[PDB]
Amino acid sequence: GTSQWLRKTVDSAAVILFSKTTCPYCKKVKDVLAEAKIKHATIELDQLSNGSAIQKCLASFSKIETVPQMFVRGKFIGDSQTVLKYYSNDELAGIVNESKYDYDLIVIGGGSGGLAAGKEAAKYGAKTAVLDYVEPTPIGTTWGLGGTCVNVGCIPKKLMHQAGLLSHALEDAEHFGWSLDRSKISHNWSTMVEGVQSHIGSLNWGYKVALRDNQVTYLNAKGRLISPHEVQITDKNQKVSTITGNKIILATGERPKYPEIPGAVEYGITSDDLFSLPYFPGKTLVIGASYVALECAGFLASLGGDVTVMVRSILLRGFDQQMAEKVGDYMENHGVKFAKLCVPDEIKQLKVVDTENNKPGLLLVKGHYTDGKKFEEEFETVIFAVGREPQLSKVLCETVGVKLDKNGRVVCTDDEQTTVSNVYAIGDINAGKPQLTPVAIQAGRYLARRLFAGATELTDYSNVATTVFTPLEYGACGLSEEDAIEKYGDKDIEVYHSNFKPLEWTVAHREDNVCYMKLVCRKSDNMRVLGLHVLGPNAGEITQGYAVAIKMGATKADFDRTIGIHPTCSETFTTLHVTKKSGVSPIV
Amino acid sequence: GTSQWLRKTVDSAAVILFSKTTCPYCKKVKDVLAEAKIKHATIELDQLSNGSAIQKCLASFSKIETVPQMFVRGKFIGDSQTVLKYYSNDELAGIVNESKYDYDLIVIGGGSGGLAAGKEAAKYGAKTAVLDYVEPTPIGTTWGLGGTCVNVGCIPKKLMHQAGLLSHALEDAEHFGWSLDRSKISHNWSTMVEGVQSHIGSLNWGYKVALRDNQVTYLNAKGRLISPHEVQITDKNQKVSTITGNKIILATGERPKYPEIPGAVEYGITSDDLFSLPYFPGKTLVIGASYVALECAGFLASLGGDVTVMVRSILLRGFDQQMAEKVGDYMENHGVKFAKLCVPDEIKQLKVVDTENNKPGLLLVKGHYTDGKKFEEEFETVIFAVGREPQLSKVLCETVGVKLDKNGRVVCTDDEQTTVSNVYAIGDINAGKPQLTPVAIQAGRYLARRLFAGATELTDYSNVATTVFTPLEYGACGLSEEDAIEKYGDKDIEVYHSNFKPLEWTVAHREDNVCYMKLVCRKSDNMRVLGLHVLGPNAGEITQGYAVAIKMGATKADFDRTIGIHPTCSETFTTLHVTKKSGVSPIV
Numbered sequence A, B: 001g002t003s004q005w006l007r008k009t010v011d012s013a014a015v016i017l018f019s020k021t022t023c024p025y026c027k028k029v030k031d032v033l034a035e036a037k038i039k040h041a042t043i044e045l046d047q048l049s050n051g052s053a054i055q056k057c058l059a060s061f062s063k064i065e066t067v068p069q070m071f072v073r074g075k076f077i078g079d080s081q082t083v084l085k086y087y088s089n090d091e092l093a094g095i096v097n098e099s100k101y102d103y104d105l106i107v108i109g110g111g112s113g114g115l116a117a118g119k120e121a122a123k124y125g126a127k128t129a130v131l132d133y134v135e136p137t138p139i140g141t142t143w144g145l146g147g148t149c150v151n152v153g154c155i156p157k158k159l160m161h162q163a164g165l166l167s168h169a170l171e172d173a174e175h176f177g178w179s180l181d182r183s184k185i186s187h188n189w190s191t192m193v194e195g196v197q198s199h200i201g202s203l204n205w206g207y208k209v210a211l212r213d214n215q216v217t218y219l220n221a222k223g224r225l226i227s228p229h230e231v232q233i234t235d236k237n238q239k240v241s242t243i244t245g246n247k248i249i250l251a252t253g254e255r256p257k258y259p260e261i262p263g264a265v266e267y268g269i270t271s272d273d274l275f276s277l278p279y280f281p282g283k284t285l286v287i288g289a290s291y292v293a294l295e296c297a298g299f300l301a302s303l304g305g306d307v308t309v310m311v312r313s314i315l316l317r318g319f320d321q322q323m324a325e326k327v328g329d330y331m332e333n334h335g336v337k338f339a340k341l342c343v344p345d346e347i348k349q350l351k352v353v354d355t356e357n358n359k360p361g362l363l364l365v366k367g368h369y370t371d372g373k374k375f376e377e378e379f380e381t382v383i384f385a386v387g388r389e390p391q392l393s394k395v396l397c398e399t400v401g402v403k404l405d406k407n408g409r410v411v412c413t414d415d416e417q418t419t420v421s422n423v424y425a426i427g428d429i430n431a432g433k434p435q436l437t438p439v440a441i442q443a444g445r446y447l448a449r450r451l452f453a454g455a456t457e458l459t460d461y462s463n464v465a466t467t468v469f470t471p472l473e474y475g476a477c478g479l480s481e482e483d484a485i486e487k488y489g490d491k492d493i494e495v496y497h498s499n500f501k502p503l504e505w506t507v508a509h510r511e512d513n514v515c516y517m518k519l520v521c522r523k524s525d526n527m528r529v530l531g532l533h534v535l536g537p538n539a540g541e542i543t544q545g546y547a548v549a550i551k552m553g554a555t556k557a558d559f560d561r562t563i564g565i566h567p568t569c570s571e572t573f574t575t576l577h578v579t580k581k582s583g584v585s586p587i588v
């Protein structure tokens, strides 16, 4: 596979140097390029097992087998004397700049995946442009560079989650000896939002500075792929232009869905609006049962809010359903109200948002339960969390030939390639892939390395760990119990489980036998860990390390041999013994 | 090794049944034993690869090769018909009770290791006694069942640590929008102590109930091994008696050291006294630089205390010294004062503890710095944390023949056996072993299984993860950087590292570039992870999962391929790229 690898690498790399760590002529070229401020990829052949074979294969491209060999956009440009010739004649800058296209890479979308791909490509001398545009929500909310996670996703969600957790810290404080009057303590929504938004602002600015420092052209513009290599751009002044690029990365993400009911778009809000909302939501209805719905409902209740969640059928569809029930039970026990087996019919406005006192309006929500009984209740705020959708009709001309699935997501190969061979898709729009920030980032970085630095490594989308940041957090890595049983049969599945209690909860008088963990294992494969699940505080911190072990093919024996750290919650994974089949209670 | 294994198993097991899962005669015996309330170990031969060989070998003990075969204390007692014969004749209870000794196992020490070993042995029908006695501290402090971790160690330490962390949660709360008057908030030491001690009380009681429920004889008595099988006991009424046991487990732990200076024993306190201290310590001097010293100094400062730490030479000797410096730097930056290169000479009393108002006394501490300058300062409380020591002269007669090392710890084989073959040592007194609670527990449980259930599994003492619960926590698994370099040479070591910042610290306006992590790797062994180190909040929760991966022989590649969970602190381990040799700054 050496010949195939080199053919691909030479064809795709923007500026690449084939080198050896011990060669003085290679160092001379490296020093020249560094002085000339020419960024490039470097392949050290003496550090590869097939390095000798690569040298021989290079002759098919350069007619020489020696090092160094420099290539620019598919063409051999010279050995050490030749590169220094260009340098001494003021020709080098022009040569390493010659291109058929404006850019080696155009990234459409300045979110998690797009920024990661763009920055990484620039490192290897790919002339890169990143396009980002945020179409305003129906009520007019917009934000800066960084995409969903930075502005209206993971970052503000976790910060508001923390504000909520601090409510319970205030309660715990008394039991640990702290003297305070909780009856005189209140939360100010707008002060929290201002703090959150100040941090988001530093991230917006941070990414702009990063792109500048990486010599990436940032355009705050709407991009449209009109042919394989042509991107139509519309700027802030509505001026339309066309730029060209060799490789294109589609990383445009998704936006919240709205139910097709009267009043939904006019009066409801989504997560897009919530995180910069100038007024306190007040009495809130969340319509939906996604992790987004439950996370938002969760922190609103902890901030003292009157919160109701309207659930069509089940919670967290796709997630382990035992764990999902436990997540919901905790929320219900702590004041989140659930309108079960219930759907909305219409939203009517009873009061407009006060824009000078920053107070919410009032809405009438009409719906019905499956039993036929009517739902009719007043809420100050209605939040829709009924899923998210790609919007590639706004990004992609149909004549380009990029294939989309029934859901409107891009059908990709295992190296992120679309049906148009120079066009790639990463992040939430990549059909079938886990829709998470670190996945988008890994995909973008690994892709950029393959395109421009001769890397071979593909992104591994299997056993990607997750955490739902509900009031009691839920971390998971691998298969749900039901999926493992479906795949391998009940007779081949063993489940080890236990309740636990954080030491911190003892003095604080919190619940016994609520925090919970399980390992789903395959009996015939040396008790291989197929799935890990934990409900408890800091579940993300607990889960992460185990994801490495699971990647390596951890068995129950590996967990058993490892010694716990005491006192922690995570140590409970090291001493599990109660099986579900035994019928023994998991209580402690 | 089948013959050797069976010989050992038959010789050592108290009550054991050799069985097959498919055999109806085996089920009959199991049902008889369960009805008769006879606990026993069971070996299912059809579940072992060498099961057929074991059947043949059993004939050397029983003259039969069939299942079931029941053994009591080294003797074949019968097949299925024979066991049922004993049962129908009211003979079975007497037979399974026949013994040369009072107990199959006597555990001296009712702490982490001892309780774990005792409870586990009883499960397999070993007649077990657990002895525990707490010799009072010089000022008279004593406590209940459960040992060091439960009463004067991990448990109260972490709870007071949490009380300290809640101080900073109160600060963070304001930035997250919570309205409170911090100028009117104070901490009450005694209220905290009462809460902590209430939980310790439930653990004391919990362990007593557990021993009762496992049919373990608990004696609140001082034990002394006077011969291999004879233990002299002294009860609360000073009455002296002798009990006999087949196997003996020494699990007597350690107690705090005092420096040999005037006033030390009379006026100073240790961790033994601190966790139930009826008065607030007030202005405090901690003498020592162990994890105990720094943990205690740490939480006292967070509870608003005026705290000084006297350090002879370095912090956390034995731990990674870069990490140790970072731990100390954080503490110093947050108000813990350090008296560096300083030793104490004498403690003089200036005021006696007020026993009715629960207020501290006052002490004058005189010392000297290495530069010759005098140390003279008044403190309300002086705490010694200058190490811990075994006290086996109080437990062990010299004529028994149990070998101790220069430090007074028991020299053991890799299966915890002392130089007296029926006598074993576990926990802190086992020479050379990591002195941690889960280690003692694993050792005790695994030993009990080997002795009484035919297990082969040894305790793995390598790469045992740790966490120091200082104000900023420090988690580690594996080798320090300096130890890795010493072992393999600097040229074979690569260190990947990064600063990070908890998302929670952003809005709270806490430090950039203080939290830190590194992976110490071996270049020639596919970048094998030799050591993992993390400074940051919840470092124990972060570290634990990775300890499984390290046990399995994780490489840098395994970390790289694993996807992060966002937003967490732990995810930073999945994207490390900056090496120490490159000289690139780890700042973010």
Ligand SMILES: Cc1cc2nc3c(=O)[nH]c(=O)nc-3n(C[C@H](O)[C@H](O)[C@H](O)COP(=O)(O)OP(=O)(O)OC[C@H]3O[C@@H](n4cnc5c(N)ncnc54)[C@H](O)[C@@H]3O)c2cc1C
Residues within 6 Å of the ligand: A108, A109, A110, A111, A112, A113, A114, A131, A132, A133, A134, A135, A146, A147, A148, A149, A150, A152, A153, A154, A155, A157, A221, A222, A223, A224, A251, A252, A253, A254, A271, A292, A394, A395, A426, A427, A428, A429, A435, A436, A437, A438, A440, B565, B566, B567
């Ligand atoms: C409320 C919420 C909470 C979440 N929490 C987590 C979490 O805790 N952990 C986690 O891992 N994931 C979380 N996620 C998911 C995570 O946000 C996404 O997986 C990630 O942001 C996807 O990044 P992306 O690069 O694919 O697209 P995005 O981050 O959405 O970026 C795409 C960008 O491209 C822009 N764009 C669209 N069309 C064009 C165009 N025509 N021209 C130019 N620009 C365009 C978009 O406006 C956007 O700025 C959360 C999501 C939500 C909604």
Ligand SMILES: Cc1cc2nc3c(=O)[nH]c(=O)nc-3n(C[C@H](O)[C@H](O)[C@H](O)COP(=O)(O)OP(=O)(O)OC[C@H]3O[C@@H](n4cnc5c(N)ncnc54)[C@H](O)[C@@H]3O)c2cc1C
Residues within 6 Å of the ligand: A565, A566, A567, B108, B109, B110, B111, B112, B113, B114, B131, B132, B133, B134, B135, B146, B147, B148, B149, B150, B152, B153, B154, B155, B157, B221, B222, B223, B224, B251, B252, B253, B254, B271, B292, B394, B395, B426, B427, B428, B429, B435, B436, B437, B438, B440
């Ligand atoms: C302040 C402090 C904090 C710590 N924090 C942690 C931590 O966070 N995590 C961690 O893993 N480890 C921690 N440790 C260490 C941990 O406590 C010990 O490793 C563990 O308790 C050792 O248990 P053990 O069974 O060996 O002995 P112990 O728990 O000490 O139990 C021995 C018992 O035997 C009794 N005894 C002694 N002599 C006799 C006799 N002659 N007859 C009858 N009984 C006798 C003793 O009084 C004691 O009750 C901490 C230790 C200290 C001091």
Ligand SMILES: N[C@@H](CCC(=O)N[C@@H](CS)C(=O)NCC(=O)O)C(=O)O
Residues within 6 Å of the ligand: A020, A022, A023, A024, A025, A055, A065, A066, A067, A068, A079, A080, A081, A082
């Ligand atoms: N004339 C060549 C010099 C090539 C050369 O002398 N390089 C040596 C390494 S120092 C080489 O490639 N030798 C053969 C090999 O390494 O296999 C140039 O200017 O680049």
Ligand SMILES: N[C@@H](CCC(=O)N[C@@H](CS)C(=O)NCC(=O)O)C(=O)O
Residues within 6 Å of the ligand: B020, B022, B023, B024, B025, B055, B065, B066, B067, B068, B079, B080, B081, B082
């Ligand atoms: N007489 C024996 C019965 C032994 C017997 O029939 N057991 C069968 C299993 S059901 C057996 O050991 N067969 C030989 C084997 O399993 O290898 C007893 O009372 O224990």
Ligand SMILES: [Ca+2]
Residues within 6 Å of the ligand: A559, A560, A561, A562, A563, A564, A574, A575
């Ligand atoms: Ca274990």
Ligand SMILES: [Ca+2]
Residues within 6 Å of the ligand: B559, B560, B561, B562, B563, B564, B574, B575
């Ligand atoms: Ca990774």
